[PDB]
Structures are given as C-alpha cells and as structure tokens.
Design a protein around this nucleic acid. Structure first.
Ligand SMILES: CC(C)=CCSP(=O)(O)OP(=O)(O)O
Ligand SMILES: [Mg+2]
Ligand SMILES: [Mg+2]
Ligand SMILES: [Mg+2]
Ligand SMILES: [Mg+2]
Ligand SMILES: [Mg+2]
Ligand SMILES: [Mg+2]
Ligand SMILES: [Mg+2]
Ligand SMILES: [Mg+2]
Ligand SMILES: [Mg+2]
Ligand SMILES: [Mg+2]
Ligand SMILES: [Mg+2]
Ligand SMILES: [Mg+2]
Ligand SMILES: [Mg+2]
Ligand SMILES: [Mg+2]
Ligand SMILES: [Zn+2]
Ligand SMILES: [Zn+2]
Lengths: 402, 402
RNA sequence: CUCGUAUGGCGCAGUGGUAGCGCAGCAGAUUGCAAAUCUGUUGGUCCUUAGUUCGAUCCUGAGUGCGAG
RNA sequence: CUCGUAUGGCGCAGUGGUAGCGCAGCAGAUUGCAAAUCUGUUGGUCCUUAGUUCGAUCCUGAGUGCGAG
C-alpha cells in the first residue's frame, strides 16, 4: 500500500542529511517532526537544515508557527497527516524526520480525540480542573476511573489533569478508552533509527553547540529576548511554545564570565536530551511498534556512506518495492539495542502505589513510590533510612525516660 | 483492543494440547484452522483432538463440512471471522489452532474478494479460462497485466488461472490489487510457534502413524473407500476436498504385503508435510507478520511443561493484560529460526523469466527458470549439460558433413 | 544341475562409442483446491574379473548376488 | 622561614555524638505543553597521624599537599 518512511534518532546523528539523500533517491518529500523547528525563523539554535542543502526537496510542517501560538500533538497530527495525504496523491513518498519521537505516535493512533467530541464543561468540573490545590484534581480522578489514576503519580499534574479532562469531554473512562485502542499504524511504515555511541556523539554535540554560537546564535538569543522582553515574560514562561527550546532559557540568567556558564548549561541540556531520546526510542517507540525497526550505525562519520547511506537505501529500496526486507535489521555492533532486555524489558509493569509514612518531600507531601521494585528501592534508600533513624531515636528518648 | 491468540506449528508438536491449556487458563475457545479437520467424522486419520481431552473448551470451524462439499480459503475467512466476532462479544478470547498456516492469511487481509464483486463472465473470457490448452490461459494473462504473470510459472495452472479469473470478475489488474493491499492484521494478535527438531519429530510422527492404524484407521480408510466407491471416483479425484487428506489416497493402490508399502507411503507424506509446514512458517508467515512471533521449544517432551506450558502462559498472560511482552521471543536453542537468513532472506526476489532453448520437459515444453540465481543453476545442471552435449556433438556431425 | 536378472537410496529405461526416468532427498513458489498443487535440482559411471573389438554398461567365458525352477 | 586552605565527579556549607546544599550522574514515567514536565535514586566517613575527652569531620599538636610578602 502507501509507503511512508520515518527517520528517528538522537539529536546530531545526521537525520536530516540522510532524509535528503533518501528523498532524492526515492522521490519523496520531508515532513519535519521537530517540536521546535516548527516555529518561525530562529534557525541557528533550533538547528534547521539550510536550504542550500535540501537539494530542493520539499519540506512540510516546519517553520510555519508564530511565536505567539503553542504547537502540540493534535496540531501535528492534522498537519502531518495532510502532508502524508498530499505527498501520496502526487506519486511521492513522505519521509517524516525529527527528534520529537513522541509525535510519531500519530503514525499509529496513539491519542485521544477530545476535539471532535465537544461537551460544555460544567462549573463544577472546571472548578476541579482549574483548582489551586494539586492533590484535589488527582483524588477526583482516583474516584471516577481509578484504573487510570493508578498509572500516574499524584504529582504529575499536567497528565493527571489531562486524564480528567478526557473523562469529562468524552464522558468515558480514559482507562477504558485505552483498552479499546488499536495502536495499529496506518500506512506501510519503515522505521529507521540512526544511532551513535554516546561518547562520540556527546563530543560532536558539544562542538556543535560551540560553533553554533560562532555562526551567530547570540543574535537569535537576543532577538528571542527582545520578543521575550517588552512582553513582560517571566522565566517560568519557558515551559510553553518556543520558550521551551534548548538555547534560550539557558542564557536567561545572563540576559538577567557568566555567559560561559550559560553555554555549558546549554551543552548539558542537549546532552541530557540526547540521552532521554534514546530512552524513549528503546522504551516507548520500539515496544509500541512491536520492534519493527532497522538500525543504522552512525558513530564513525568517516564512514556514514557505507553504514548509513547505502544500508538505508538498501532497506528503503526493498521497502518501497513492496518487498520483504532482507537486511539484517541491526549491525552486529548495535545488535544489543534491539534486544528485549534493552527495550520492553525495562518497561514498568507494577503500578500499585505505596506511601511512605516516615518520608516526605519539600512540598510537605509524603513520598509515594510506584511498583514494588521501586518501593523497596526507597525503603532501602539513605533518605528513608536516615528518616527512620531520627524517628526511632526520638521514640527511644521517651523509652529511656521510663 | 480485542485480543486473539494463534498457535502455529508443524503436525505433531502438540498444538491442540497447548490450545486447551491456554483456553482454560485464559478463558477462551478453540477455532480450528485445519483444512482437513473441517470434514465430518473421519477423526483417527484426520487426527482430531478427542472430546475427553478438550476440558469442555468450545471448538469452532471443525468437523462440520460434508464430504460432498469442498472447503476453502473464503469458506474459512467467513467462518473463522464469525467465530472471532462471537467469541469476543462474549468476553472470551479466540484461539485459532491448526496446521494449515495458509488460512491464517485471513488474519491479516491477504486475499481478494471476487464474490461480493459479481460480474457475468463472457463466453469469450470463459472459453479462455476453461480452455483445454494449458499455455493459452497464461499468454492471456501475460497480455492483460503482465506484471502478475511474471510472478507465476507458465505451468502453475491453478494459480495462473485464478489470477485471470480475478482480472475478469474485478476488471482490475491483479498485480495492482496487490500493490494496493494492506496486509495489516486486524485484532491484536499473538502468534505462538510450537517447534521441534525434525529428527525427534519425525520419529514421533512415524510411531504416531503406526499406533494410528492400531486405533482403527483402516476402519476409516474403508469407510472412506465405501463413499469413494459406488461414486465412480478416480484416483485423480484425490485433489479435491477430503480426498486430499493424508491417510486415504496413500492406500488407494491397496484398495485397488502391499498394505505395508501404503503405510510407509503415508509415513512419507506426513514427514514431507511437516517439512513443508516449517518452510511456510519461515518464508511465508513470519515475513508477512514482520516477524512478530514467539517460539516454543517442544523437542524434549519430557519437559513441555517448562518450555511450552509455562512460557506460553507467561507470554499469553502479558499479551492478554494488554502489556508489552517481556519474554525473550525465542529460546537460545531455536534463536536461529527467527533470524533473517532463515526467513525473509530465502524469499525469491528475482522474477525475470528465462527459457532454455536446448532443454525441454516430458510435456514437450521448453524449460523455463525464474530468477537469475536459479536460471544459472539450470545452466550448470547435468540436465542442461547433457542436453548441450548431444546438441554440440550433433552439430559437429554437420561441419564434418560439409 | 534348468533358466532369468545384476544400473546413482529405492523402483525401473536404454544403448557397441563412456547412461537416462519415477519415487525419496535438496531447493524455489503459494492472495478460492493448500494434508493439495506447480517448479528447479544433487547423487551412478551401468556387480567383479578375463577376453572379443579401433572402442563396451550393452558381445563371450567365468566368478559373486538375487529371482522363478 | 611565619600565616592560610584543604568535606562524595566538580563547586561550596557545616553541629561535638558517627555528615550536608548545588551542579552533574543513575533510574522510572509520558495517549493536547514532550528541546518540555513529573517521579525515584547511587555516590564521601570530612587531607594522614598522635593526643584530648565517654565521644570527633568539627577541639589541641605535629607530618603531608596546594595558595600568599
Ligand atoms: C495427520 C496430519 C497430517 C495432521 C494433523 S496433526 P496436529 O497438527 O492437529 O496435531 P497437534 O495439534 O500439533 O498435536
Ligand atoms: Mg554526517
Ligand atoms: Mg535536522
Ligand atoms: Mg515570529
Ligand atoms: Mg500526538
Ligand atoms: Mg537521563
Ligand atoms: Mg491438532
Ligand atoms: Mg520437502
Ligand atoms: Mg505433550
Ligand atoms: Mg537425473
Ligand atoms: Mg535396484
Ligand atoms: Mg585388440
Ligand atoms: Mg573390458
Ligand atoms: Mg537531578
Ligand atoms: Mg582521632
Ligand atoms: Zn521513607
Ligand atoms: Zn537447458
């Protein structure tokens, strides 16, 4: 049927560069899937692929959102799908490329449509949602459909809230809506994972951050700060839209010697991001797609042409030719990445909540662990231990008094 | 979503016995998928699972067809699906078990519906189909939609004919109908493959055949011969319906010392069938389902409980719990069976036809190889070689002639 | 002691100029027959020996084996 | 040669009773914020030694290493 190639991988592995090659070779168009690259201008830090390097290959869902609006999942689902539709009804083959692997879920119905299902929210319902208290909205969820409330920590406000918002707009238990999902991906899809040992990658990521300021990153940072300013924006705004990007908020303290620390801070966010990306691909993506993915070793750039270009084209050629791929699916060196142990095996299955009666966090609430495995980890943590000593020792102060 | 478990494997690995265990443990019903077990009575040779061993677990699409009719794919698709539907809308979980892995294709839309698409066949069209000549129907196909005619050898009458039958009833090139298929399987399916080293299996299959006659196989063979007889049936009828079963046609020459040979002949058909089954599962099934299947070593029956029962239950448990399976998917010992080399790698990709001008078969036609790889195999075969000698040697009796 | 045969795993062809097939085996195929069907293909040097002959697996003799006497 | 400072990977607190805060690191989560966000967590015995005292990282006195006229 209608083929669709998707290139995934950590930041700085050459996804875009590969996307182009495949686009030319197989007549296709790029469909960005980068939560930040969808914003107007701000190319250097948001690291967009320069036009003079796109070989004229069309790109969609990229650099079209104004800093005034906030992009998101469903905004990507409609935009991404339209592109797919279009590129298909033109004899071309779509190639979605981005580091926001989360959005990929749209490729296999992994979401809830609360839009088409309109429903006037009640004063009562709203008052609960937009409530000042944190644990109030949770207890509400725990009440109506506790099976979903047990999969979310009572502090995960964003999500716990989301779940409740669904229980209302759909009037259907979210836990049930999930047991009735398909997850089957539409369109014959070919997932390509361009990997690279962390050590080498990190080094490149650090230099790429350096020569990124040399190309005039600060000019963009200040511009961003201009709009940021004269708009009475607080640093706590850096959790919405473009303000989330890795390249602005890091220098905020500099924009009120010191600039260096804001750079090292950026080098850290990027490094962390890269690490989190692999985690998602190994614990979220792969498991979801039953593990139908092919790896591409991009650790030794001196190579690339052999390990990436060719291998990709090889797989892609058979894929597009509506034939079963004969490729090894994973080069010996990275063969372990697709193993169950490194993937589905790490996924949390125990959800029973536990509440420590002796430990409590800065927010005053008592510690709550999820899953017996981690519940024990806590019990044996120096945190819990130390807390259990002051407690015992205190209890004794009286025993001795008698 | 709606779960559906499928137990596959060669004949005599214990599929049915396992199907029951899983049925009980997980509240489900069996849906037979054995092209022969769907016929009335004739249990011993058709090897049906005895009632006193089904723990009351309901069975569908099994032993309901009269020897007068001929079962087939679409007959299975409607029957199988109805059972799935029903079993589901009752809180139960279906468990399709059978050795006719071919039918399984219904689990992932791998067929063409020429029924719902009625179309009065033309005298001209029919005269081509039901034509006495063999290569006439082929050349017709080669004309209208040669892309499909190039994937079938000009001697594969059954199929070449079928393809043409589709081009008519649907008025759509079959080659195109395939490039427009989905193949995506409906229902969240869990494929279990119960394997067993050939050597041990064969030994059991042989004894299985022996003690099969001891339980009164001949009684069924004669009964079958009764209906067969007084019906003026010729041995060439053993290509339709029940008459295909392995246990009847083998003794036909005995039914007109000798009975022994008819038994050894049966022991051979069974052995061969088992070999062919694995081939289908490794070159057809697995590749089609992108390799989402779990192996179960059933070579050492002394075990079974550990390697089969438990492992299956383990995987099944997580499956049904709508959770990502953490099981290894393949026990070290059989780990190689799921490798690409043993699977998709063996699939024929070269379809260009080749015709040897010096070699010809008993039917008078010239040899026709498919795929350069096999085209060469022929060119170097002693057949071709020997034929090229008589040719050359004869030509030399011409140069000398002048 | 009459006579007949003796060919790749089995069952068979054939030929005076160094051999074919069926089955098994191995392999490819499979979108209404699938426990069925189609396709390709690896195995011998024609029991041993001494002769006839330009040359024998196919002729003569003998031995060895097997078969109906 | 007289003063300072030496505490988990880096940076810095600190009470007489057997140690912290920040950066990182590690891990779990993710179905309208995901370059985001929530959650859990490993690390050192406080530069070595002799005293002092019931007790020392912190108190006294040496020795080691770095900074300063
Ligand atoms: C007699 C023949 C050729 C096939 C039927 S055996 P089976 O596949 O039904 O037996 P199991 O379920 O594997 O025990
Ligand atoms: Mg590169
Ligand atoms: Mg890029
Ligand atoms: Mg703007
Ligand atoms: Mg989404
Ligand atoms: Mg991390
Ligand atoms: Mg059975
Ligand atoms: Mg075979
Ligand atoms: Mg058993
Ligand atoms: Mg031959
Ligand atoms: Mg013989
Ligand atoms: Mg002579
Ligand atoms: Mg001789
Ligand atoms: Mg931290
Ligand atoms: Mg001391
Ligand atoms: Zn605690
Ligand atoms: Zn030839």
């Amino acid at each position: 049927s209608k083929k669709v190639i998707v290139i995934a991988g950590t930041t700085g592995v050459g996804k875009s560069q590969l996307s182009i090659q495949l686009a030319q070779k197989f007549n296709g168009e790029v469909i960005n899937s980068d939560s930040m690259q969808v914003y107007k201008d701000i190319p250097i830090i948001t690291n967009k692929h320069p036009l003079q390097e796109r070989e004229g290959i069309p790109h969609h869902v990229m650099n079209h959102v104004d800093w005034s609006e906030e992009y998101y999942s469903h905004r990507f689902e409609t935009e991404c799908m339209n592109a797919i539709e279009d590129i298909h009804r033109r004899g071309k083959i779509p190639i979605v490329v981005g580091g926001t692997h989360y959005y990929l879920q749209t490729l296999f119905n992994k979401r809830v449509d609360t839009k088409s299902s309109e429903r006037k929210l009640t004063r009562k319902q709203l008052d609960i949602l937009e409530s000042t208290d944190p644990d109030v909205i949770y207890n509400t969820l725990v009440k109506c459909d506790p099976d979903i409330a047990t999969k979310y920590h009572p502090n995960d406000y964003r999500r716990v809230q989301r779940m409740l918002e669904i229980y209302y707009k759909t009037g259907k238990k979210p836990s049930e809506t999930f047991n009735e999902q398909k997850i089957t991906l539409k369109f014959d899809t070919l997932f390509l994972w361009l990997y690279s040992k962390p050590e080498p990658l990190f080094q490149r990521l650090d230099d790429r951050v350096d020569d990124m300021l040399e190309r005039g990153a600060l000019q963009e940072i200040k511009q961003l700060y201009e709009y940021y300013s004269q708009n009475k924006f607080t640093p706590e705004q850096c959790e919405n839209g473009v303000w989330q990007v890795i390249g602005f908020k890091e220098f905020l303290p500099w924009l009120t010697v010191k600039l260096e620390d804001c750079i090292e801070r950026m080098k850290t966010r990027t490094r962390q991001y890269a690490k989190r990306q692999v985690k998602w691909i190994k614990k979220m993506l792969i498991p979801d797609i039953k593990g139908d993915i092919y790896l591409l070793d991009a650790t030794d750039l001196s190579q690339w042409d052999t390990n990436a270009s060719q291998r990709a084209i090889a797989i892609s050629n058979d894929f597009i030719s509506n034939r079963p791929i004969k490729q090894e699916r994973a080069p010996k060196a990275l063969e372990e990445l697709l193993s169950k142990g490194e993937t589905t095996m790490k996924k949390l299955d125990d959800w029973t909540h536990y509440t420590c009666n002796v430990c409590r966090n800065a927010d005053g609430k008592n510690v709550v662990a999820i899953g017996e495995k981690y519940w024990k980890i806590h019990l044996g943590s120096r945190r819990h231990k130390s807390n259990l000593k002051r407690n015992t020792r205190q209890a004794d102060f009286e025993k001795w008094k008698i």
